[PDB]
Amino acid sequence: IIPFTAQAYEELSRQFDPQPLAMQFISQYSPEDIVTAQIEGSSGALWR
Amino acid sequence: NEEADYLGVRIQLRREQGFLEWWVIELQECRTDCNLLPMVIFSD
Amino acid sequence: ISPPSRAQMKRELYNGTADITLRFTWNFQRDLAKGGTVEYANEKHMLALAPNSTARRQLASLLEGTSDQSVVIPNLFPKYIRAPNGPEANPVKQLQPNEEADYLGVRIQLRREQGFLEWWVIELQECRTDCNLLPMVIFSD
Prior knowledge:
This is part of a larger assembly, with three copies of chain A.
Chain A: E1 2-3, H1 6-15, H2 20-28, E2 35-40
Helix pairs in contact in A: 1-2
Family (chain A): Belongs to the PIEZO (TC 1.A.75) family.
Subcellular location (chain A): Endoplasmic reticulum membrane; Endoplasmic reticulum-Golgi intermediate compartment membrane; Cell membrane; Cell projection, Lamellipodium membrane
Protein name (chain A): Piezo-type mechanosensitive ion channel component 1
């Protein structure tokens, strides 16, 4: 999990800047707020 | 769409009998997201 | 774990220069009938696994194929824990002065007895009956 930095936050906000409310969500949430969901995908845990 | 604008996800059961049923969560465009899917959580 | 994860986990212990997060979470779920807001008192006692250390080289061979490697985890089993009704399994300091080096010498043994039948016994550096029943203590509040 990566706590998004100020620069990272700017990136996300700019990605969704065209949509006002999309950018709003990101921008309103404080920097080091938006966290990165780097969920693991590899397995080994068998299907049961 | 938030159901059609999330992120294209794929699944791959890896039953390599040696069934050794594993389960990798890939992406429709898996680059390194078969082992590390990078989404985001706008936290509050 | 699997070829995209266990073979990678293997590799880490084999070579891969990384520090496996050995979070020894000591969750202590109590009750709520006698009180205990966040009864579950938990603390992830992490042991960053130094790339190919003595412990990780034992783990290399453990995950290679053999099941006879006593992985030395430097004193990391809290034998005295001042846990309260909050969510923290903080061990008593002074009870265990180093409290990371004064916990209790813990060992690990993967028992892959192909018949890989990968089991996992938590032994002790001085395992008498603590390979099946590790006796620590929780100073409860």
